[PDB]
Design an enzyme around this catalytic site. Sequence first.
Site, short mmCIF file in Angstrom:
data_model
loop_
_atom_site.label_atom_id
_atom_site.label_comp_id
_atom_site.label_asym_id
_atom_site.label_seq_id
_atom_site.Cartn_x
_atom_site.Cartn_y
_atom_site.Cartn_z
N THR G 1 44.98 20.94 62.84
CA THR G 1 44.19 19.88 61.84
C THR G 1 43.31 21.14 60.94
OG1 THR G 1 44.52 18.85 64.72
CG2 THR G 1 42.78 18.47 62.74
N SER G 2 42.95 19.59 60.46
CA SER G 2 42.14 20.35 59.29
C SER G 2 41.30 19.29 58.49
CB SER G 2 43.16 20.65 58.04
OG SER G 2 44.16 21.57 58.16
N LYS G 33 43.36 10.99 62.83
CA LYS G 33 42.16 11.81 63.57
C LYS G 33 40.32 11.35 62.53
CE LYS G 33 45.35 15.19 63.24
NZ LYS G 33 45.60 16.91 63.29
#
EC number: 3.4.25.1
Lengths: 241, 243, 219, 224, 240, 204, 196, 244
Positions: G1-2, G33
């Site tokens: 995840t970024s 997200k």
Amino acid sequence: GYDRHITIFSPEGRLYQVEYAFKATNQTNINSLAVRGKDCTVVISQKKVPDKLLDPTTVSYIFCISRTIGMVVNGPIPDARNAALRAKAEAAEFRYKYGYDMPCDVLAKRMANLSQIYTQRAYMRPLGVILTFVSVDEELGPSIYKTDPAGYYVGYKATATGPKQQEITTNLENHFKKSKIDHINEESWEKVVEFAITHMIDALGTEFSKNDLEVGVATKDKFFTLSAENIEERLVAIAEQ
Amino acid sequence: TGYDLSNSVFSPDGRNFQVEYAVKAVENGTTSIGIKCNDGVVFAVEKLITSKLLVPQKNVKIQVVDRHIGCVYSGLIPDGRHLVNRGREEAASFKKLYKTPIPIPAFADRLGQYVQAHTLYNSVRPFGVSTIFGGVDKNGAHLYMLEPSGSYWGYKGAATGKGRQSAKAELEKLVDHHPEGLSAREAVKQAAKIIYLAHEDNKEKDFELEISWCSLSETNGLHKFVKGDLLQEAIDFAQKEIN
Amino acid sequence: TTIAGVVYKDGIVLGADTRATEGMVVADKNCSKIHFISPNIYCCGAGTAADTDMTTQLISSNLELHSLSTGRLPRVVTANRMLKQMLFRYQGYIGAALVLGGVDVTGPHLYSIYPHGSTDKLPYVTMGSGSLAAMAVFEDKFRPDMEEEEAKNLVSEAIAAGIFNDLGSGGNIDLCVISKNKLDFLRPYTVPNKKGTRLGRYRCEKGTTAVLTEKITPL
Amino acid sequence: TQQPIVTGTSVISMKYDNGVIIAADNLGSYGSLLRFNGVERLIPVGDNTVVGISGDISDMQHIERLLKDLVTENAYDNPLADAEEALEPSYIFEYLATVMYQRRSKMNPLWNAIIVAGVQSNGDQFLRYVNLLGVTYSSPTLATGFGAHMANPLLRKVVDRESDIPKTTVQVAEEAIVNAMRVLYYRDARSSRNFSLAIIDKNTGLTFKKNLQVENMKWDFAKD
Amino acid sequence: MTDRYSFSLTTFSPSGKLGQIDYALTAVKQGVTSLGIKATNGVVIATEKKSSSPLAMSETLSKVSLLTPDIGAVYSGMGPDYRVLVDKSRKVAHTSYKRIYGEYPPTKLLVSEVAKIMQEATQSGGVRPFGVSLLIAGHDEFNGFSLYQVDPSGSYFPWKATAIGKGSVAAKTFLEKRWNDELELEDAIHIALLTLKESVEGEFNGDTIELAIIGDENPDKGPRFRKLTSQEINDRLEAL
Amino acid sequence: SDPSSINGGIVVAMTGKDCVAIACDLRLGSQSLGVSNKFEKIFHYGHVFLGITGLATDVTTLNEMFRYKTNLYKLKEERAIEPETFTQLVSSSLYERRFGPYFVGPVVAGINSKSGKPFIAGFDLIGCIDEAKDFIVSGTASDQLFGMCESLYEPNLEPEDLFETISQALLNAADRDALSGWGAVVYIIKKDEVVKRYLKMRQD
Amino acid sequence: TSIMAVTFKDGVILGADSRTTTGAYIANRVTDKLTRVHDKIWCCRSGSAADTQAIADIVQYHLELYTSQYGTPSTETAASVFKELCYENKDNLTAGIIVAGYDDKNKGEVYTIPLGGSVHKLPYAIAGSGSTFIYGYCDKNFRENMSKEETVDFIKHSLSQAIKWDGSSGGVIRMVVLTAAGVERLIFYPDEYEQL
Amino acid sequence: GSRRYDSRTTIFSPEGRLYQVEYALESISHAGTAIGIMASDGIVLAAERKVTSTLLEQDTSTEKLYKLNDKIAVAVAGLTADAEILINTARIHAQNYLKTYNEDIPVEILVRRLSDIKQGYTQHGGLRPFGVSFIYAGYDDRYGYQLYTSNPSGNYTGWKAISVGANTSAAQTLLQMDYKDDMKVDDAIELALKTLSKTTDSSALTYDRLEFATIRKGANDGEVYQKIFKPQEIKDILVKTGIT
Ligand SMILES: *[C@@H](CS(C)(=O)=O)[C@H](Cc1ccc(CN)cc1)NC(=O)[C@H](C)NC(=O)[C@H](CC(C)C)NC(=O)[C@H](Cc1ccccc1)N=[N+]=[N-]
Ligand SMILES: [Cl-]
Ligand SMILES: [Mg+2]
Ligand SMILES: [Mg+2]
Ligand SMILES: [Mg+2]
Ligand SMILES: [Mg+2]
């Protein structure tokens, strides 16, 4: 005669505390009215600010329960706010548990089932209020549902509540007898509000200024109340035809 | 009959007589007032000097909630204190969760719902106080008054207790003669006067003036008591106006 | 287990194999893995079978009571929430891995629900031990807004991929097609393997087994 | 039981003739990652107390709110809240000490080391330490974590026993503290150049200094 | 708030009467007429939709409620009390029965569960009895078609046909003459519409009458409960 | 240590033409020590039969529990419970101990009295239903029984053909398991007669 | 995840990749997200998907109920509710949440809540496994009061690098712009951002 | 507070009687008569239904005679709903005993249990008592055939023949006159119906106004069988004994 003090049956099969809670309903001496358009549901109510020391902006019996649902109350303000807070809480809990906005009628039934409990359980008194819920439901369209101290509830094409409810009711009944439809055949809510105000003027026989009314409007995906100036614009249009 | 013997019983009128009897205790109490000004609120109260043995300035009646709300009440003083204790718990839980200090309308309903709850059952007595309260929040100044029934509204000016009619008449003059508004320092002076004029209803005993205020300019939006020179300046202004 | 679902033009196609296993042994070769939630919502089930069965049954029961009170068909989001919030509460100990598909007033919706209480809303999903085999078929051939018989074939092809390539998966292919106008519960949709034919008869003749005593009681 | 995640390093402090000094760098480390460079770890309470906190930053933020809430609560029905019945360093400390030991005894500690520095009503210097175990002690110099090993030795050369406190001026004490902060910056891998310092004097009151920096840095011997 | 009513509000009077039950029955008497008739191949239940206002949408107010797919209920007396019994009946039919046995309860057992709830309001602390009498019609595999009455006391009796509320004495006499053990469902609906016309003052049509049946399966099974439409009632009123 | 294989034993059930059969061994042990050769694992509640393998204290407990529940069922419903209904009851009862289960392997067998349809079912220890027409197996020699049943079984057997099939499946599976045997019982169940036969088998 | 949130002149922009992995398997390659807790208060989620979803749903509920009673909540209020959940349940949660919102009074605001349950108000925030690789880049390239186009490019370049190096990150770069003008959703595909 | 509305159901009168128990007995005196008669080879339970219309579905109706287990039955007099609460409790106690000891519950033990429940409502809790009197007909292998009765007080006693409900004074005299210790079930059936036929407040005793049952060991291989009589069977036994 303790059968009149708590919610138990009298020999006639009556609950006097429920009946006396119905009488508390008119203690404010305010008349409300609710009608349905095509795209909207309009609710109007008398606004009475007798004291000059009162902040008139804080004198309201219309409540925004959720974004879609509005609620006008006929009855004393402490019981009105009791009912408002609970309805708001129930609508929020519903959306959390079930993942969609609480429908107007589902809330009305929920509040009615709560009202029923006070008529059966002795330690709780009934609230001295009639709750008129309004929305534009995403399944059922424009909706008006009403709850009372008995725990009764029902949907309406239009309704009226208060001391002079019978006059307003018959005025509305007579209009819908002519048009032969369950609603106000009008595109804009602005004109449905103009109808609501006009038919209250005729029924009650009183003229209104901008500060004598309080208006709530339900559309698809939002319920909102009108400001004094929004109502003034509405009153200008009525006078000009 | 018998409808007035138990709390939360509707009479055949649709009334709760026990609540109306609580109002009689409120009407029996000393005069308290509230004045909404330009950027804040002023609270003032009549403290009856029963005896010379009372220590001056010590038996404080006005109570602070959080750091920005002032509460004053007429009637059964312990009932008022109980309500403020609850208010402090409400204001504390609000700030704990939401970080911001409790707004005045938000706070007004917290007290309102709690007082209303004491009209729902026969196992509790209604509050024997009308409570005048308010302060400064993000949306500006707010003054409220809260009755034994749980009823409350916003006010320009408020008054309760034995001298309420006298006070109300004076508050109504200020509202008429200042439509553009009243300053915080003006409101402190006027509050003093109004308590002094409303003292004619409790004239047998002499009294002690107590004033507090929240103002955005004068107190940084925080509740402070009017003390020393500013209190004496207000007493002098009041004494001049009665003479 | 290989379970899968796709969103097509008119609605939802769900798919499942039929092999129920205990360890390495196959207990049932034709066991139903597509469950009823409501008349417009179905649920494919993988992971721990008891958990899968009971979780769907409880949420189906609660949605039935919800739907009786509101008087309108239940939504997929409420089915999704009720499963999700329960599975989350139990912190993964209820080993239910569901593909939830149905058609609302708001249109068709497809979800994957995991044992820990996470959900993804997707146009296609696969779960169970054959999810990778099935997902390969979807990545190869899926496109949005498919016609019904095309989507049926793609899901059937994805379940087949699982059946043959994954040892945990096997038996027949069940489908469930959901749209606004109909619900088609196809069991079995395909029988990709014939039952193996036995060349001998090994059944014993009467009197072969040695008995000690006998008792007969009528009812 | 938890583990600390975002952390603050050394809080250092000492007594001098008229009051106390306390200091702490502005870093919130996330393990080896020097994540947050603007974290204030000295938190004043009234005009007579500064609470310096090391360890878990979420638990520090919790304690920060407890102290903020303590000020509010003391003002309630208290006409002498800004005078005779204002909060004292000793009251603020004893509260925190009670909390810290109560939490360790429920096996759910606030993962911190705290130094409460201040000046009392009667002009007395207050300087006392408390940690996650509820362990308390006072000394003319106090330091948490890393500073206990490197700052205390330097600060004890200025005030080695009680009798040295009246001999130590505010200038000598502040120089010593700022010197110690430089030494910690060279040698503590989880420290930062930027720090805050607070002097609580019985005459001049609370002086809070922000955005200080370690300077006069000897690196020139590296080139060889 | 202490719910201090931990003592019975229904007690025996010197005569042996349970006052509150009798008074609840008086409330039922004042309520609008409803009735039930059992045929050989079905059961019918019916009542008048007494509309509180003509502006009110009486379609939203359902007096006849589905409890299970094969069981229906109607009442006379206090509507809000009925509503919460229907909620509990539907729920108990899932919790104490369907989640255990994987099928819906038989009519008699669901009736028995509702009766139990009503009995408890007649003995528990701090409650009045329910102000309704229920008529529960249903079908199950091993008992067949059945019709039950349930009173505020918690007492229940099975009926071939009966009526409750306003004009129940007159309606029961009317049914006694018309009922036999060889009625078809259509014959029972016909008799129900006749019997109900006597107690109705005003308008008598599909919009002012609510009428449902327990009959054949409407396409695991189909549901035997079916609420008749406003049109379906009007059709049978022309052959009346 | 493994509760499902302390006491040992097996149950098998089969369907035939207008009949069902259920059979079990008679062993109860403490691992290697044989204790009882009269520990029957098949019980009945009206016309519904229930075999239970696994931890013997739970076998006994569940028998007593289903007797309790089916007795109350009969008093309330005024009829004996059917196999389909009982199966759901077992499943519910097992799953309500999801996180502290009975270490058992139940097997339902019976004929639906109304429809006349032969019915069998099996469960894991937490109540997931194996709902197979052909055969259900359970116990320490379940693998052995699966093999025997898969090769011996065929559909629509007459009662005394089915007897020979189920008996040979049990006996030969049990003889390849250390913790099964010591005797065996076979019930042949028809719509209105039940034949209970004890089998002669090797006693080691 | 970024994930990242960046304040700029007209307000604030949230940004995120779309990859969710179960070990080395990409379970969902089109994950959203960026989740909405109020009209103009959104959050970026990292950590346990079950936990961050459960939290975000509770927050949405609290802010819905706040709005019913007290009107639109501040971004600070939203961050406080997130914090309260994350901090009080730190032992049972794995959630790293960035909270971002637009008031008219306060304009754009970004709060980060890392694993501990601490709150940090920042001009911009980065988080998730892929964030480690872009601390250097983001620090060097971030300026205050950037234009909308500059901030979109800053987020796009940053997450492009986070994706390039982090295997746990990937797929599309989603963004959500929060200004007085309203709420705008942006998407950027691999073929666009990879060639940067 | 609430004290104002409290009836105080669990107090003594000045004479030392429990008000509510006495008033519940008055309630029960108006209920339909139920009779139990114990013979050497079985027990008879007979009971009179009340109000009855032609439209009451009799074959699926049970207001008087209930089954507790395969050995024990009860005849009810009073509030049917109240009885059903107590009956389901009794049905559980029997199964708890069976589960614990792997033997059927002895009749007296079950009776004491129910009677102890009734007693509790007269001594504590502030609730009204159960307006029910039971006749328990049962068998066990200690005492053989047993008849008991309990009433709202929680007092229970054993009997050879007994009545509860309406006209018990008249009924008990007629039973005391014609009962003998060597009597048999078929004779007791006749005595029970003759007693009801004379004590009934109806004009005549018919099959549709009766519930009837027998507990016989009179079965093959000495096992106890409960027979709840069907409407047609009650009609036959009425013709046999010569009442209709
Ligand atoms: C496939 C799931 S997989 C291999 O993880 O992808 C399949 C899905 C399935 C099967 C049956 C149904 C029935 N309605 C629904 C969905 N699941 C299984 O094969 C699953 C692993 N098997 C079972 O749960 C099995 C069912 C028996 C009837 C054979 N039971 C067990 O394996 C238990 C599991 C268990 C024991 C103890 C604690 C938790 C779980 N075995 N044992 N023992
Ligand atoms: Cl409800
Ligand atoms: Mg009440
Ligand atoms: Mg062997
Ligand atoms: Mg051996
Ligand atoms: Mg990558």
